[PDB]
Structure formats: C-alpha cells, structure tokens
Amino acid sequence: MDEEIFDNPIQKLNYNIRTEESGSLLKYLQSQKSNFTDSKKFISFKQKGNDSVGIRKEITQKKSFPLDNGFIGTVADPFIAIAFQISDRFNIDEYLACRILYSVVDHSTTRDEKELIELSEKFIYQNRSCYLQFLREILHTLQSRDSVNDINHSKMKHDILQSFIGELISEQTNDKNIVTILIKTLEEKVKDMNGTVNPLECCFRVKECIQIVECLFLISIQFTIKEDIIKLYIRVLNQVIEKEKREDSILKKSLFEIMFTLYFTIFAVFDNVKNSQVFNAIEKRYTFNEISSTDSIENEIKQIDNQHPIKSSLYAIFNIILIAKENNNSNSNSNSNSNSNSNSNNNNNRITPENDSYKFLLQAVQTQEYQLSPLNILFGSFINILSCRFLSNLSSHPTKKDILY
Amino acid sequence: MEFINSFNLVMSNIFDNHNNSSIEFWRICEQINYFQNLWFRIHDDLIISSFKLMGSLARCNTNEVFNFFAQGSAQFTWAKLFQNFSSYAHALNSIEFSQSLSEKDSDALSSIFQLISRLVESSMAVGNVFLKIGPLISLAFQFAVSQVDSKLKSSALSVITSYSQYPIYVADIWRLINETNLFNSGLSAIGGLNELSFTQQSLELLLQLIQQSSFLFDKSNHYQESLKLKSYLDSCMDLFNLLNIKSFNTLDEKWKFALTLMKIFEFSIIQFNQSIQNFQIDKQHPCYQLYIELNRSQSKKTTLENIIKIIDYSNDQSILIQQQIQQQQQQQQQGYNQDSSRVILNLVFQQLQQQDNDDFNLLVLKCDYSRPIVSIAKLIDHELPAISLRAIRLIYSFECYTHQISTVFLDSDPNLILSKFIKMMEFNESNFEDFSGTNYDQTISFIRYASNSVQWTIAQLIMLCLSNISSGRYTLAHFLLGCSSNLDLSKDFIPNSKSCLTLIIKNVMNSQFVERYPHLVDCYHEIIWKMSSDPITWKPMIKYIQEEFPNYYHDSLLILRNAITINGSSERRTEALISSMSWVFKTCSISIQNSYSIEMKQFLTRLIFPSLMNLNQPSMSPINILSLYNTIEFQLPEINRPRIFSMYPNLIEYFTTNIN
C-alpha cells in the first residue's frame, strides 16, 4: 500500500483489464487480495510503528529515506521537520511521510511549510481511497453491458474478475469478508463524520462513504448475500438515520444519498429473492438469494426508529416481498378443496398505507443514473401492487384509505 | 391519492431527460395493464400528475402515448381534450367579450398542454394529426393572450414553440404573434417575477422562430416583418442590459435567460454576416442595430460591458471550479454558465470573421485591447477544450491585426500567461485510444478534436510569429519560446527553464509523440529550423541545443527513421516524417558549419561515416550516410493528371492553389 500508492494502481488495474493477458490479470488480482482481506489497509495507510523513536533518529542521523527502485532520497533538516510534522498531524509512518512530502515537492512549484502540508493533506485524504476505487472500477466492469461487449472477445477476464470478487464474498471468517469490511468501514467513517472539526477531511470522508455504499450496491446486484449481512445493512442504515438526525443541514444531503443507496442495496438483495438472479460465489453458478428467517429480518426492520419514513417504507417493501413469496407457495397446493375464502382478510390487513413512507421513496430518487435499471426493477414490482390492489379498489365515495392510496 | 400522485410526479422527473429507461417502463406498464387501470376511470385529484408523467414519457414513447389517448378506451381522449380546451377558451373569450378557471384547472390544462407540446417536440407526424382534431395553435394563442395564470400562458406558448420547430407553421405562427401583439407583453422589461416564466418561454419562442425564418431578415418582400423583428431584437438588448438588475428565483434561471438571449444574438449576427455582399451593408437590416450596440466605444454602453463581465466572471468561475472540484457533486448547475461563455467566445469570433477578410481590408483601402485579450488568455487552460481552443483561436486572429500580443503579455503577468500555454503543451500519454475505428461518432470525435487541436493551434501561432519576422523583431513566438524578455534576440536562452521551446524539443525526442502526432512533429522541427537559420537567433538556439540537448541530431534521426520504417503507415504520416527529416538535416548542417563540437565529431565518425576498425572495441541497422539515403525512398510517385481537368479544362487555374 504505502509503496503501491505511488505506482498508480487504478491505471495499472485498467491496463490489466484492457491490454494484458488473462494469465497476467489473474496474477495481479491474486497479489492484491492481500490489500482487500485486511480492513486496516483498505481505506487507511501504515499508522506509526512503536519505535518511531528509533526511525526519527535514523532519518535525522542518515539525513535520507528510501524512495522506490532502491533510491536514497537525501534531504535537509527543514524537509525532515515537515515530514515529521506530517507524520504527527496524521499519525502515519515516517518513511511514508518522507515519500508523500517528496512527491508533493516534485508535483508542485510551492515552498512555504503550509503549502506543502495542505498539498500533503490533500494527497493523504484522496490517495487513502485507492483500493475502494480499485474495487469500484472492477464492480463497474462487471456491471456495464458495454465494456462487457469489449471484454466478451476475451470473456475469460470477466470470469476471472467475477471469481476474484466471488472469493472475497465467499470467505468464511466474517471479519475478512469484503462486504463485512465495507460495512464496518462505513460504520466508523459515518460515525466520526464531522464538518465542524475538519471540513476538507469530512468532504473526502463523504466521497469515501458514498463509494463504500456504491461498492455494496454493485455487489448486491451481482453476487449472492449471506442472510445476516442483510441484517447488518439494516443496522448500518439505522445508524445513518440516527446520524442524519444529529448533524447540521450541510451534511444532510450527503447522509441522505448514503442512506438512499443503502436502502436500494437492501431492495437489490430482496428482488434477487424472487425475480433477478446473481452469481452464487460458493456454488459458482447463478441463483436467487435465500431468506429463511423472515422473522429475524422483520424484527431488524422493527429496530429502525419510529420517527423516520424509511421504517414504514422498508416495512411496506418487506410485506410486498413476503406476499410475493407466499403467492408462489400457494400454487403447488392447488389440489385442495373449497376452503380458501377465510384467509383473504389477513393478507389485506398487512398493508396499512402509512402516508409518509412512500414520500421518502419519492424524495430520494433525485439520484444517479447507474441506479435506473434497478429503479425500473423496483417500479415493475411496485406497479404490480398499484394495478392489482390500489387502482382496483378506489371507491366512488372515497374513504380515508382511498384519499391515502 | 396522496401516494399515486406522489409516484406519478417522480416517474415524470426521470423520463423528462429523454431517458430511454422509459421504453422498458412503458412495456412493463402495458404487461401489468397499469395505464388502462389508471386512465379507464381516473379520479379528479390524480389528473395533474398523470398528465405530467405522460408528458415526460411522450419524449421517447411518442407513438405509444399518442395511441393510448387515441384508442378511445380511457376516460380522456384527444377529441375530448380538444373539446375541453375549446369549451374553456370560449368561456374566457365570452367573459372578456362581456366587458366591452380554478388552480387545479390551471395546473391540469398546463400539464395537458405540456404533453401536447411534447408529442410535437418528438413528432411532426402527431402535430400533423392534432391540427386535424382541431385548431390547436389558435386555442394556444387564446390561452397565451387571455387573463389566465402565467403557468398556463407559458405551457400554451410551449405548444406554439413546438409547432415553430417546423417552417410550414412558422409563417402563420408569426402572423398570429403580430396580430395578437403577444411579444409586446412576452418581451416586457417591466414584467415581474411571476411573468419570468412567460418571458423565458417568449425568448425561447423568438429563438426557435428566427432559426426557421430567413424571411424575417428580408426587405425585398418582408420589409413589413423585418421591421417587427427589429422591435423584438431592440427589446432583447435592454433585457440583456437589465440582466444584472432584474430578479430571478435561482442562478440557473439567470444563466438560462442569459443563454437564450446570447443565442438570439449569435444567430442574429450570423444572419447579419450572411446578408452582406459586395460591400453593401444594408443599414435597414434588423440586426444592424445589434451590430452597432456590440461594435461600440446608462443602458446604451452596458451591452459590451456586460459581455466582458461574463468573460471576467467565467475566469472567477474557472478558478472557483478548479478549487471546488475538491467537493462538487454540483456539475448540473455549471453548464448554463459554461455554454453562455462558449456562445460569447463564438460571437466575438463572428465579429472578427468580418475583418479576417480581404473584402473588408480592400474596403479600408477605399474609406484598451489588453484587458479583453488578457481575460481571454486566462481561459487558455479552461476545463472544457471547446473553450480553451476558442481562447487560443481568438488570440491567433488578435495577433494577425497587431503583432503586439508580445507587449500586451509583458504589460500584464507574463508568467501567469506563459504557464497556461505550457500547461496546454505538456504531453499526457494516457489521453489516448486509437482513431483506427470506422465508427466516427461526431459527439465523442468533437471532444477529441477540440483536445488535439489545442497543441496544433499553439504550434501554428508560434509558426505564424516566425514566418512574419521582419528581421530583429521580438514576437509572440519569441515570447512563447522564452527568448530574452529584454527584447534583444541575440542573448542566450535560460537553461533548465520551462518555455514552449523546452517542451517542443522534449516532445520531439519522445518516440510515442512522433508516432502519434507526425504533422505536429514536422511543424515542431520547422520551429527548430527557423530559430536555427534566422541570422540573429541561430547562435542562442544552436548553443542551447548543444548545452541542454547534445544528442538531438542522433536521437531525432533514430526516432524519425524508425517511425518511417513502420510498414502499414499511410502517405500522410510518411509525408510529415520525411519533411521533418529534411529539417533535422538542415539544422544539423548549420551546427556543423558554425559550431563543430566533440559530440559532432563523434556523431559523424562513429554513426554517419563509421570507419571499419572502430567496430572491434567492446569498451564503451545503424544510421550511416547510405542507410539514411534509402530511408527517403527515391521512387517518387508518378502523379496522374486529375480527371476533373478533363471535365473542366477552362478552370485549371481556378481549381489549383500555388503553395509558394
């Protein structure tokens, strides 16, 4: 990582996807698996080692540090002081802090202490995201139909990329698993988000939180998901709700886009329980997601707060999905006589229209075009209930349900 | 009905952007019979939103939305909607003729007019059936004139704008505008914040009309109507002078209002320039007033003054956007200011493209530019190449009239100007994917053209200011190449500096730059040759080659010879590489004649004339005199006589041009 970040791993990824052999792409992804399976690298540099009190003497007494290709960067005492201040201000390893300050002196004309320290701050806050964006561009290479035409001539590359993320998703120690790493990283990056202490860091932390949920979204329209990861998505969404309630107006748009894309990640997991299909990373075939403990997930949706319209809209969606799974399981039992009439009442009491639930579902669709295909899958499902239940029951002396529907 | 209205309004907001995801959505709605179950017995409160959803879908599902209200199965149908419109119009007309609507009616007739406009935006064939269901244009004029809501006036006027997209209706729409006097309110400087939507739609109607009516610039027949066009253009000029005084609800409204006015002026000056023949500037032309309020030295000075403020403010904005890209998810709000800046740089270029002309200079033979030039030069490194290339091609014409952009840049900050040319001349190897694909999309190609034209236009700007040397003159070429800012050209270059010269030589010795851009390398070598063959600068130049670039005559012959040797190249790559190879030989010839160094001794005796005994020293096809000769291929092409000279022998000297 602390070497690889100067090596532009996103340009080298895109070369590995376009121009390289499948026999090379497979090697590069297998080494990079060591950055993805450790939640301390994935969006964080090499934080200070215990004997910084040795390393700072070594740098001061050599007056040099290691660059790449074996080069020994010889440096004056003011550069060593600025690199030590960068290493303190951000608590990073001193040999990285010298390399960052060097690259910031190469790629600028500026020479006041503060210019080099803000350019280093911006280098640190942007380039700490390298593996999140490396994962994002693989996930869009797996998602676009269009680069999938270019790659169909070499389709073994798409099978390799789908197998590679399949190994990050199949992984059995939950704490290595890339979906759990994205989840935990979102929990802490959202938790400690605050524009009133460093607004520059907070804007990069917002971009990181959006791109974490984008990676979770793309994974949830491409791969099968383990039932308790769905329960984690609902818990992080509830923590974004309790963050949104507390932060000022400025952060509310960014928290709302993070919150909506998580809400759509939960819908993407759920449509794959009946209509869509995704790559089963354990069976290496396409399947549905299975949901076995309905009443576990329903009691996670019940642990969302009662003040936020997301609760009743997820509860409406979940009762739509329950009724969509029930209305399959009826049809094999068709060799049974006459006695169905009683049960009709229950599956019409499940849908009380709680007014402002769908008003969140409106306000949050002011969002980005990569969601439009999943949005049409939501709307095709949604239109099925609008046509079959609501338009079919509007009365010509409208009640307090008809004024609602 | 809260929930169904809510769903319809967000589905409207998606498909309004011409978004092809509508086509899946429509077929899904048909398979679920959703539109039938909605419209067979729709309820009063659902009407407004359901017609907005249909008016969004009507952009890309034009035929299907039209057929749905034609098939007669729904609670609304085209003939029944036209019966409602004519009933409401006759009710307005008879209330107004008795002196000599609800809010839901307004927003519903507004969204039904919006749908009817959309079914004409995306189909003349549907408009050519609507006019057979009733007199829709005349009904729209009645709703635009009578005392109704500004929303309903603008949505009725939108239907008139979508019929004025087709010249066959433009003459009768224009007749009806001048009968109804509509623009005598629709272009009102005085009209308030509530009338801003009717003002904007009237400017958009005027823009859409002029783009379809050359007859409004005529005075041989249409003198009665070009006079009326002037009355509307002179109104648009005080609206543009008021553009920093009149109020808006947002900044996006202001820049859409600016962009419509600027595009009226852009097309009005094109239809002025296209009307001048054989010196005869007709002083009755409607745009001759706009030409006199632009080409000029309270509101009757602020026209050019407000244009210059938008050139200054587009530099305030490019500096603020190169900062705020560190935060902005906000690109959607930039575009109206960026396109207003692009149209301003088109219009200034269309004031120069009457003086970039022999007829004007042959007319002159019978008869503070620094701030404008410098606020254009600050846009050389603009984030859109279609603005950068406009600033550079404006500076090209401005140097042709003056030969003094050299002093204007020294009077300023020459560092902040020269660094913008350098920032455009720096080679990025990653901006590359091959032009070998036959499927030349004009959209993607115009962006790649606007990119790669920048370095070509900077190279040709340096070349012009080397071809136009009366001896000893410092020029914008000498400025860009970094010749001494003391004007004396007989002084050495500054070593390790960045000028365009330091980049020209370092791009020439990049083999990928030579393989990708051979005509730009031929041009770059003609710069090197001219700076090495002028009687003043040759000594500074050849000294600077020997002090910072001593390999230059080996590495350039190596790279050019290899780039020629690549089989499957085309005649126009081979052309420029062989032209470039002549310039290397002649530049080397002056260096040998006047500056014979120990590197030149080693170059001749180990590479060009390699004496046999030297081959046995392991203690340190080659480029020898004979391997150089046969790289030029002295089989010249046997030029066949053009078949057009056998069709038009009387036009040979008209169909050729002498390069001199």
Short mmCIF file of N, CA and C in Angstrom, two decimals, chain A residues 20 67 161 176 185 213 348 363 379:
data_model
loop_
_atom_site.label_atom_id
_atom_site.label_comp_id
_atom_site.label_asym_id
_atom_site.label_seq_id
_atom_site.Cartn_x
_atom_site.Cartn_y
_atom_site.Cartn_z
N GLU A 20 -3.64 -6.36 -21.07
CA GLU A 20 -2.94 -7.54 -20.54
C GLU A 20 -3.59 -8.89 -20.88
N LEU A 67 13.30 5.98 -1.26
CA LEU A 67 12.35 6.04 -2.38
C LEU A 67 12.17 4.61 -2.95
N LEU A 161 -12.55 -11.87 -13.00
CA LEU A 161 -12.99 -10.77 -12.14
C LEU A 161 -14.18 -11.17 -11.25
N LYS A 176 -12.77 -10.95 7.59
CA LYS A 176 -12.06 -10.79 6.30
C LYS A 176 -12.98 -10.41 5.14
N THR A 185 -16.28 -0.40 7.84
CA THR A 185 -15.62 0.84 7.43
C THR A 185 -16.65 1.95 7.25
N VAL A 213 -20.85 2.62 -0.19
CA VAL A 213 -22.23 2.17 -0.43
C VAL A 213 -22.46 1.83 -1.90
N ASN A 348 -54.74 -8.68 3.43
CA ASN A 348 -55.19 -7.30 3.20
C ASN A 348 -55.05 -6.41 4.46
N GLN A 363 -38.52 11.38 -2.54
CA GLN A 363 -37.55 12.46 -2.38
C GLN A 363 -36.12 12.00 -2.69
N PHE A 379 -39.81 -0.43 -9.78
CA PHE A 379 -41.06 0.12 -10.30
C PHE A 379 -41.93 -0.94 -10.96
#
